[PDB]
Amino acid sequence: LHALLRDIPAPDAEAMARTQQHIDGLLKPPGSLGRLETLAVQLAGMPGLNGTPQVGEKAVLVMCADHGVWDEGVAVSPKIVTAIQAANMTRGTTGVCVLAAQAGAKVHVIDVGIDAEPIPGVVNMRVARGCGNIAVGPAMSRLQAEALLLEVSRYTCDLAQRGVTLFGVGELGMANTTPAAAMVSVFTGSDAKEVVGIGANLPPSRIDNKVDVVRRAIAINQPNPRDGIDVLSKVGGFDLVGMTGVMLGAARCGLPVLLDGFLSYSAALAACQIAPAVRPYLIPSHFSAEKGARIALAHLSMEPYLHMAMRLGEGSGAALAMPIVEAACAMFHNMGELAASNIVLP
Amino acid sequence: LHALLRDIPAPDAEAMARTQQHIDGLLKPPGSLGRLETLAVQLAGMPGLNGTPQVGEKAVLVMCADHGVWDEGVAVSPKIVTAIQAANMTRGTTGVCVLAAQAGAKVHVIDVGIDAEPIPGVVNMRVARGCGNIAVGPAMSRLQAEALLLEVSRYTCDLAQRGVTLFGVGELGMANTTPAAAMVSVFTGSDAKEVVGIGANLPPSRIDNKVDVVRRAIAINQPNPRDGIDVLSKVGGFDLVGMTGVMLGAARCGLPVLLDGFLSYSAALAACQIAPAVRPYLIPSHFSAEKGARIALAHLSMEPYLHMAMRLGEGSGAALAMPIVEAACAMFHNMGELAASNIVLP
Ligand SMILES: COc1ccc2nc[nH]c2c1
Ligand SMILES: COc1ccc2nc[nH]c2c1
């Protein structure tokens, strides 16, 4: 793990300088393509990309897990939905599935802690049948966290070998916006009221209780903000852990990762906390409709591309942004050059 | 023309109600897919869509024209770029071309007023070799405007027959952000300073002059804000006119049109001014980096999906949004249903 972390490559500034130069000479007013240009330069700096903005195979990793905190009345979806939906993931009927297929990406369903019998077709990395209830104690042990980090990391980088160059991260677990709020609050120093959202249609009347739960998790666990692994294990969840793992793995592998929504922001705060070197590999997707979105993003210093008012999760936002990433490559590679037209612009 | 305008169909509320119902039953928390849901319902209401969100063939229409106002020192690109770039459009090397191809859309280059010899491969609808200089008089005659409106309209709806279901609109004409600013100012009642942008990298020192030019165009022409055709003809341009025409045609045809950036916003204000019935067919794409973007959009009551800091034009933003439109259809059609999973959500 310390190994893994140490070995995260820095971006190739040399490749980046060449990219910029090339971009500047394309058939257009310099910088006219805004964020598409920036995006492309960002990709060129990623070592696993071979000095150029390029997209090979695409995968979306969905981390599924149940949470003890569900018993605190924080989630109106019935617990079993995790298991059901997870199964659906295997049939290509979910929101992520549909969106991924549209993006030509492949969805990988990973069970890291579902409170149900194993589901065939789902990758089994199950830590336990749901995590501990953060309202009265830690979600899991430090060891348990580090281990999953390792395991997910590896799996992630291993896909790299199969030709994957672009990752999308997602989750599935009833009541997960709660631990998410807790983490944000902790890493960010914001009060719970500020970061707690309605999750999957939580009735306005039930908000108050959700906030209390969050505050409690915090007070009881005393998670240390300067220690991401500490935070994750105490008030996080299996699914949160797994997302952070994907992020560490893609970074170690020198590859780009597309974030999703609020849950994903939480995991990104942790990964950056654990390894700042991770930052440059992260790519925002959309701007989640969850209440704590703006704060979480501000702390990440990220401005998403898409404003869709989405709040489904599953990695649906991630899939949705893939074409944008492809567009930047097409731009980079297929556009003609000013010089070839004898055009000169200031 | 009065005919055309009269015959613009209202959206099918019945189809819309069925869409919503169907959407609500999909494998997810109701409304969790935000704007993607809204988008889909919007499409279902379009008569040319056959009661459902669907996308057949896709086309991007690029209106190219030169402007007399170029002589007022408002644009740093050399005039000839219109002609050059237009030619490039025919080779698939431009920004729109690259983006359209990525979206599987076809680009249609239309010459409505280029100040150069005709370009083979380009559709010829040339009104004149550039429009009049708005700083000292009208861009063209009312008749000239109405005619192009008619001609572009028809061409547009005619594509509908060839299987096109989704239009994207774009332009190409050096110095065009100037007439654009003028129109915005007029329709919006904003002062020129507020709406005048840097266009294609206009040096900050040269801004002042651009604003004066705009104010002048206005004072001299006295365009009537309650008359879109009046505005267009006086301080607009051939390309502006043509964009408005695409919009009227797609609406008459009962089809959706994707807007681009600032120039496109201008044309949309005019079309809505001329025919409010046009509104429901319009679909924002991205949020242009041009200074007058926010005002123009506010007047259109539109919130774009994409924040890319783009300012290239050509219909590049339009192409970029196409996959989003496709995504809403996929969602609508390929997602599984809650009932089929025995899942019940509040
Ligand atoms: C290719 O040079 C230019 C200059 C201005 C432009 N506006 C749209 N495309 C452009 C290309
Ligand atoms: C299908 O029902 C549900 C409920 C919550 C969910 N969160 C993500 N997908 C979900 C599906």
Going by alpha carbons, the residue nearest to atom 11 of ligand 2 is B28
The set of residues, in sequence order, having a beta carbon less than 8 Å from that of A118 and lying 6+ positions away, is A111, A124, A126
Element (H, E) at B107: strand B106-113
Angle between helices A95-103 and A316-334 (to 10 degrees): 10
Residue A108 φ/ψ region, left for φ over 0, alpha for ψ in the -120 to 50 degree band, beta for the rest: beta
CA B165 – CA B180 distance, rounded (Å): 28
DSSP conformation class of A9: P
Indicate yes or no: CB of B330 within 8 angstroms of CB of A200: no
- Could you give the residue ranges of the DSSP H alpha helices within chain B? 2-6, 13-24, 35-44, 81-89, 95-103, 142-161, 177-188, 192-195, 207-221, 228-235, 238-252, 262-274, 293-300, 316-334
Angle between helices B95-103 and B81-89 (to 10 degrees): 20
- Using a CB-CB cut-off of 8 Å, the residues of chain B touching A201 are 29-32, 345-346
Element (H, E) at A177: helix A177-188
Residue B132: count other Cβ atoms within 10 Å of its Cβ: 19
The shortest C-alpha distance from B323 to chain A (Å) reads 7
CA A257 – CA A245 distance, rounded (Å): 11
Instruction: Give me the phi and psi of B286, to 5 degrees please.
Output: -120, 170
Going by alpha carbons, the residue nearest to atom 10 of ligand 2 is B28
CA A251 – CA B176 distance, rounded (Å): 44
CA B58 – CA B68 distance, rounded (Å): 33
CA B299 – CA B294 distance, rounded (Å): 9
- Output the CA torsion B238→B240→B242→B243 (10° steps): 170
* Distances B266 to A3, A82, A124, A226, B292 between C-alpha atoms, Å: 56, 48, 55, 50, 10
CA B35 – CA A309 distance, rounded (Å): 6
What is the edge-to-edge ordering of all strands in the sheet holding B106-113? Answer: B123-124, B106-113, B57-65, B164-172, B257-258, B282-283
CA B108 – CA B170 distance, rounded (Å): 10
Q: Determine the residue type at B29.
A: P
Token couple for A58: 């695409």
Element (H, E) at A217: helix A207-221
B27 Cβ below 6 A of ligand 2: yes
Chain-centre distance for alpha carbon A161: 21
Measured over the CA atoms of residue A96, residue A321, residue A249 and residue A182, the dihedral's sign is negative
CA A305 – CA A311 distance, rounded (Å): 15
CA B285 – CA B302 distance, rounded (Å): 10
> What secondary structure does DSSP assign to B312-344, as a single string?
--TTHHHHHHHHHHHHHHHHHHH--BGGGGT--
* Distances B334 to A45, A104, B51, B125, B331 between C-alpha atoms, Å: 37, 15, 17, 41, 6
Instruction: Give me the phi and psi of A249, to 5 degrees please.
Output: -70, -40
DSSP conformation class of B63: E
Nearest ligand 2 atom, CA A313: 8
Indicate yes or no: CB of B95 within 8 angstroms of CB of A34: no
3-state secondary structure of B93: coil
Indicate yes or no: CB of B32 within 8 angstroms of CB of A78: no
The shortest C-alpha distance from B29 to chain A (Å) reads 6
CA A27 – CA A319 distance, rounded (Å): 29
**Exposed, middle or buried by CB within 10 Å (0-12, 13-18, 19+), for A142?**
middle
Distance (Å) from CA B215 to ligand 1 centroid: 25
Element (H, E) at A245: helix A238-252
* A307 has a chain B CB within 8 A of its CB: yes
Residue B13: count other Cβ atoms within 10 Å of its Cβ: 10
Closest CA to B149 of B236, B247, B63, B241: B241
What is the edge-to-edge ordering of all strands in the sheet holding A282-283? Answer: A123-124, A106-113, A57-65, A164-172, A257-258, A282-283
Closest CA to B185 of B264, B239, B266: B266
Which residue does chain B place closest to A201, by CA atoms?
Answer: B29
Indicate yes or no: CB of B330 within 8 angstroms of CB of A99: yes
Please choose from A67, A77, A171 the residue to mutate so as to test ligand 2's pocket, defined by most ligand atoms within 8 A of CB: A77
- Using a CB-CB cut-off of 8 Å, the residues of chain A touching B104 are none
* B310 has a chain A CB within 8 A of its CB: yes
As beta bridge partners, residue A162 has none
3-state secondary structure of B168: strand
CA angle B124, B130, B136 (to 5 degrees): 155
* Distances A107 to A164, A169, B238, B326 between C-alpha atoms, Å: 12, 10, 48, 19
Q: Where are the strands (E) in A128-196, listed by range?
A: 164-172
As beta bridge partners, residue A286 has A306
DSSP conformation class of B280: G
* B1 has a chain A CB within 8 A of its CB: no
CA angle A61, A65, A68 (to 5 degrees): 155
Instruction: Give me the phi and psi of A321, to 5 degrees please.
Output: -85, -10
Where is the binding site for substrate, in residues of B? 85
Indicate yes or no: CB of B201 within 8 angstroms of CB of A346: yes
Indicate yes or no: CB of B36 within 8 angstroms of CB of A310: yes
Measured over the CA atoms of residue B194, residue B198, residue B204 and residue B209, the dihedral's sign is negative
Q: Where are the strands (E) in A86-240, listed by range?
A: 106-113, 123-124, 164-172
Which residues 195-224 in chain B show a CB within 8 A of chain A? 200-201, 203
CA angle B273, B275, B278 (to 5 degrees): 110
- Using a CB-CB cut-off of 8 Å, the residues of chain B touching A203 are 346
The shortest C-alpha distance from A273 to chain B (Å) reads 27
CB A89 within 8 A of CB A173: no
Closest CA to A237 of A182, A292, A299, A296: A182
| First vs last C-alpha separation in chain A | 50
Please choose from A64, A66, A67, A85 the residue to mutate so as to test ligand 2's pocket, defined by most ligand atoms within 8 A of CB: A85
* B304 has a chain A CB within 8 A of its CB: yes
CA B23 – CA B330 distance, rounded (Å): 12
Q: Which domains does chain B have, with CATH numbers?
A: 1-54+327-346 (1.10.1610.10), 55-326 (3.40.50.10210)
- Using a CB-CB cut-off of 8 Å, the residues of chain A touching B34 are 289, 308-311
A315 Cβ below 6 A of ligand 2: no
